[PDB]
Each structure stands twice: as C-alpha cells, then as structure tokens.
Structure 1
Amino acid sequence: NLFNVEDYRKLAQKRLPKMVYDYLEGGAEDEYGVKHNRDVFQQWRFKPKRLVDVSRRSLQAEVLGKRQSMPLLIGPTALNGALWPKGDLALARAATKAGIPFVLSTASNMSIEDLARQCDGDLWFQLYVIHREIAQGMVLKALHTGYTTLVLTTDVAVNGYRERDLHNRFKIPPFLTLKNFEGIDLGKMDKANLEMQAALMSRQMDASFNWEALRWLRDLWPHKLLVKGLLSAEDADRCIAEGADGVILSNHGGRQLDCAISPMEVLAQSVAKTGKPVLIDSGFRRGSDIVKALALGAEAVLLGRATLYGLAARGETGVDEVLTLLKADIDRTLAQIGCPDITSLSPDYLQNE
C-alpha cells in the first residue's frame, strides 16, 4: 500500500538501520522546527475556480529559463549511499527520467565526474566551502563536466545540534566515503597543502565565507548560480544584488536551527522584492504543499526527504514511484482548483487560515 510519500517513509523506517533512519529523519534539538515546517502549510487553504476547462492540463515550466517536466527538483542531500547502494546515481537517474534536475551534494558518495559520466540529465552541483582552494577545484570540476547550475549552501556555518545522531553516536558507514574530497593531495609539505589538511581533517566549514566571498565565487562560475539557505527577503535581495541568478529559501529541512522560521513565511515577500527566481524547500510532502508555494510565487520546489524515502525503501524504482505519485498529486490538485496550466498559479487560489 504505497499511495503517498508517508507510506514510503513507513517502508523506509522498516528497512533502514535505526541509526541511518535517525540520520535521515532527525532534526535539530527538540525538532519543533521540522514539525513547524509541516504545520505552516495549514495556514493556507484552497479556493478552487469552478467551471474552468481542465480537460487539458500542463505541469511543464521554466526554471531559470530552462523548461522541465514540472516545477520540482531533487535537492542536494549528503550520504545518499548510506540509504541505498549508489544512492546518488539512483536519484539522478530517476530525476532525469522524470524530466527534472538533480543536485549533487558536495558531500556525496559518488564524485562529480563519475555521476556526470553515468548520467546525462540536467545536473546541478551544491557546494559547501571547507577550504577556499579546494572549493575552487570542485567548482571547476563541475564546470568542466557539464553541470549547468551551481548552488552555494550557506546555512551550515557550524553543524546543527542533532541529538538523534548524538544518542546513536552516528558514524559515517565504513564502506562509504566523501568521494568529492578523495584524492585531494596530502603530500605537499609547505603552507597550504597543510593548513588545507587542517580543513580536510576538520569536519567543519569556512564560517568566514561572506558577501565578499560570494563575489569571488560569482566570477569563478560562469553559468546559473543560486544561494541556498536564505530565510529573509532582505538576504535574498542582497544575493541578487551581488550577482546570484536566483535563491533557494530554506531552513535545511529543520536540521540546522530548530527555531528557524519556515521559508514559507518569507516566500511572497522574497518574490516581491527580488523580482528574480525564488525556489524553496523544507517540509514539502504533499502535492498541495507544492502548489501552495507555487501559487505564492515560488519558481520550483526542491525535494529533500520525500524522494529519499523512496530511495531508502525501494532504491531507484522507489524514487521513480515517489516522483510519479507527486506528479499525479500535483496534476490532480491543479485540476481540482481549476488552474489547468501550472504557470498560471497565483495567490488567487489561496485562503489565509
């Protein structure tokens, strides 16, 4: 009985080792954040437009100018290989088969190059900056291997206090490795090359990365660039002013700061202020959640745990299934509210509760 994302979560919890399941499902501190990410969607209800011809519906939509089957993406998530063998590839392939982009995490279990070589869909690369020099290396790799978009994640200055991992003393599975970091020279005896090892043996990122650093990166990357982790129209506007082609409003699926607002709380305002593509994630599970954000102006929604449940439960076929249900879910919702074309969504179909 697999008819929604929740059913896949249930199945995933039965198949995953508790430790891994907690790594996946867990949130920061009390986990009031993740609950909030879910609850915030009830602040809006639908006001369908009747007697509208919805016999022919369309979910197609442009994201940053490029058309894709639907306004969805499989967002960047670390250690997918722990959920299922070659998890990263299984995800990218289901995404490509669904006609939507896939974002490879800097902390993936499959390197930037190997994926690009084994998958021809639209690949995006999410970037964390541990060491500026090493950062430039990955960016260039992703560039030379055909990744169309770069995403800078900024909400992990320091690691979120996730008590589930603490209790379980979570440890990256032995057979898994941070493949994008493998090979990084450790022979040089001079300056860097040694302070670099300091960063490399340090599971902590460059907390100094600031606006000036964003400029640096904007020059390095010539294609579409997005800043992820924003929770304010002000920050989103600055990102656009500094060169970003768009932003991703999110609270990292409630895994960084338990009391962070839901990005849904600043979506309309960010959309109105930036005048540029505003994507979003964190809390999405139902097609209705997705449509509400879209109706509010979001350009597209990135899926995090949702598709991961499909991966953990049934691997690649599982992701396909989740993507299928969600597409059907979205389509069904568009029909129900009388908005046959997904690109015509607006605040009109919503009611503030």
Structure 2
Amino acid sequence: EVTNVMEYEAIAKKKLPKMVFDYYASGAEDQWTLAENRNAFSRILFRPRILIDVSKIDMSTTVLGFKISMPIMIAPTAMQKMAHPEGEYATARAASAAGTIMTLSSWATSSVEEVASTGPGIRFFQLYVYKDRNVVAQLVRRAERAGFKAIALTVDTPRLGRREADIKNRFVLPPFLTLKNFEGLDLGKGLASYVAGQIDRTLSWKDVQWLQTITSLPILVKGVLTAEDARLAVQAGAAGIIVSNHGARQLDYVPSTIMALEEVVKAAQGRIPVFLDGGVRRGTDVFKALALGASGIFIGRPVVFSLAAEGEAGIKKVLQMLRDEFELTMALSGCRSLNEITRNHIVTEWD
C-alpha cells in the first residue's frame, strides 16, 4: 500500500532498469541540491490557525487565464516511455482527469499531438531555444496546433549539467523510442544526439524576446533562482517565472527553489505569477511554496516514478495524494482558499 508520493521513487528504483531510474532520479554531480530540494522544506515550519471552518476548501486557481482544480501541476521530463509503455499519454490522461496542467518536454517520447489526442486538457510545452531557430519555430507551431496553451522555456541550460550516473551507466535511449516532437520536422537534413548538440550555449534575454516573435503563447521562463534574473524575466516579457533548478540536474550547489522562491516572488513584484518546482512531494510542500508567494507548483520525478510503478493509476494517485495532503494542510493551517495561505502561516530558518 503506497501512502505518500516519495514511495513511488523506491518502487521505480526496484522496477526500472538502473540506467532509466538513474536517468530520471539523477541530479548534477554530488547531488547536493537534489537533497536540498527536499531537505529545505523540512526547515520551514507551519504556524497554523485553528478553529476556522475548513469544511469548504477551495484550492482551485487560475494559471495564465486557465482555471485548474489545484495549484499542483506536472513539470516536463524527458522520454517517459522508458518508465512505462504509455509514457506521456498516461501523464496527459492523469493530468486531464485531475483538472490540472501538464507541461510536456520537447524531449518527450510522445509528440504534442499524441498527448493532445488522449482528450481535452490544459497543457504547456517545454522548450529550449535550440540553435536551429527554425526547429524551435516548428515545435512551437506543433504545440499551438496540438492545443497547448503556454511555453515553459528552459533558461538554466545553456549546457547540460553533469549527471554522472548517465556516464557511469552509458545512458542510451531504448530501441523503439524517439523524441516524437522532432519526428516529422525539418531538421535541415540519432535524434537524442541531435537535440543534445542543439542546446544553444549563446542564449541571451534577447532570445527570450525572440521566442515572443514566433509565438503569442505566454512564455514561462523556466529556471530562475535570483531576484536579478526575476527582474530581467519581467522586463523580457515573461508571462511567468518558474523558480526551478532543473530538478537539481544542471548546476549543483544552486539553492533549493524554496530558499530561492521568496527572493524571486518579491523581485517579480506581483507583475507576473511565480511558480516553483523541485522537491515537492508533500501537500505540506505545496503549502510552504504557496505561503512563500508561489502561484502554484509543478512536480517532475513523482510523475515518472509513479508512471513507472503503476502506469496512469500511479500518476493519478500522486496527483490525488498531493491534492488530499494539500487540502488537509490547508484545513489544518486554517486556509479555505489559496488567498488565505499567507506568509504568517509558515516560519523558515531564514526569517
């Protein structure tokens, strides 16, 4: 009997082949930030208010115009068909059924349209401004046609972080899986090898402004841990900021997103929504993020680990667990809406 979200990592570690579990579970180098992404939540306590009528909890929120059932969303991860045959189809169905947003990786094993064919649902598309700006365009288009509503642009990955497990595992994408967003596209004449060499080391904020010249979809600038870049993201025309450290997969010894969050929220000055991912496993984590000023969180690994465990039902139970846990956190904190989740409902180390 699985009772918390973290237990799916343990199950996925048993069930998956080492190189796949590692590929997902990996953080950069000595995985300090990966641990810190979890540990830092445990250095924030609650300051609950009691004896408040919490019989009607509303955790529903609006994200870039779209109403969703909870401030708990799915972050993009690569190649989900290594975890489970359905892969991103199951994620889409689960995310649609949960009434929340799913971000799809450009490195997904299922295309935007494949995911869209599972049924209606609000979905964002994770991108890099790759070197081949025509390929970036095609992807964007492909996403717009598939009914995707925003672009989570990765901005902390001019180069890939050193996840040493992969080198030690000789990590190769399995035989019958492809990066389906790049299939059928004009690449200018191995696809994983292609996209890896396509990650652009030269990106500036002008390239974020450029991304806005090829799509009218709101741009979530994804991977901002500093108030300095939080400011620049607003000025660059970002629809929102995801305080992400790429699941601690890029630069290690970068702060946890929870430490980083409040600096970014304040720097954004309410001009745009500030989301978080990295180390959210508990409903208490969701709350803490929101009390620090986040507009909602994404989960990455729990989706792939639970997908690996129980398929769609695994992702269903992760969203449901986080939901129930978060509703209970709200109840036991005295919060009947997300607006009622205030800074005074928590205390951090760094107060």
TM-score class, shorter-chain normalisation, is over 0.9
Deviations 1:116-162 (A, max 9, x none): 23331011111123221110111112122221111111122111111
SS of residue matched to 1:344: coil
Deviations 1:175-200 (A, max 9, x none): 111111123346xxxxxx36xx9x93
Deviations 1:224-244 (A, max 9, x none): 211001111221221111111
Q: Percent identity?
A: 42
Aligned to 2:148: 147
RMSD of equivalent CA atoms = 1.6
Cα 1:48–1:110 change in 2 (3 A) is: same
Q: Which amino acid aligns with 2:94?
A: A
Aligned to 2:59: 59
Q: Does residue 125 of structure 2 align to residue 125 of structure 1? A: yes
Aligned to 1:337: 333
Give ranges in structure 2 of 5+ residues lacking alignment: none
Aligned to 2:213: 219
Matches for 1:13-32 after TM superposition, within 5 Å: 13-32=13-32
Contact 1:49/1:349 (CA < 8 Å) preserved in 2? yes
Aligned to 1:232: 226
Number of aligned pairs? 344
Deviations 1:255-291 (A, max 9, x none): 1111111121221222122122000101111111110
Aligned to 1:301: 297
SS of residue matched to 1:52: coil
C-alpha distance in 1 between matches for 2:300 and 2:224: 16
Q: CA shift at 1:339, angstroms?
A: 1.0
Aligned to 1:271: 265
Aligned to 2:342: 346
Give ranges in structure 1 of 5+ residues lacking alignment: 187-192
C-alpha distance in 2 between matches for 1:239 and 1:176: 35
Q: Which moved more, 1:23-32 or 1:262-271?
A: 262-271
TM-score (norm 2): 0.94
C-alpha distance in 2 between matches for 1:151 and 1:294: 20
Contact 2:135/2:186 (CA < 8 Å) preserved in 1? no
Aligned to 1:258: 252
SS of residue matched to 1:343: coil
Contact 1:20/1:83 (CA < 8 Å) preserved in 2? yes
Aligned to 1:310: 306
Aligned to 2:96: 96
Cα 1:202–1:99 change in 2 (3 A) is: closer
Q: Does residue 323 of structure 2 align to residue 322 of structure 1? A: no
Mark the structure with the bigger radius of gyration. 1
Q: CA shift at 1:351, angstroms?
A: 1.6
Cα 1:145–1:295 change in 2 (3 A) is: same
Aligned to 1:82: 82
Deviations 1:318-340 (A, max 9, x none): 11011111111001111111112
Q: CA shift at 1:83, angstroms?
A: 0.4
Q: CA shift at 1:42, angstroms?
A: 2.0
Q: Which amino acid aligns with 2:298?
A: L
Q: Which moved more, 1:110-119 or 1:19-28?
A: 110-119
Matches for 1:128-207 after TM superposition, within 5 Å: 128-130=128-130, 131-185=132-186, 193=188, 200=194, 203-207=197-201
Contact 2:102/2:124 (CA < 8 Å) preserved in 1? yes
SS of residue matched to 2:160: coil
Q: CA shift at 1:212, angstroms?
A: 1.1
Q: Which amino acid aligns with 2:136?
A: A
C-alpha distance in 2 between matches for 1:118 and 1:319: 15
Contact 2:74/2:95 (CA < 8 Å) preserved in 1? yes
Contact 1:215/1:242 (CA < 8 Å) preserved in 2? yes
Q: CA shift at 1:12, angstroms?
A: 1.4
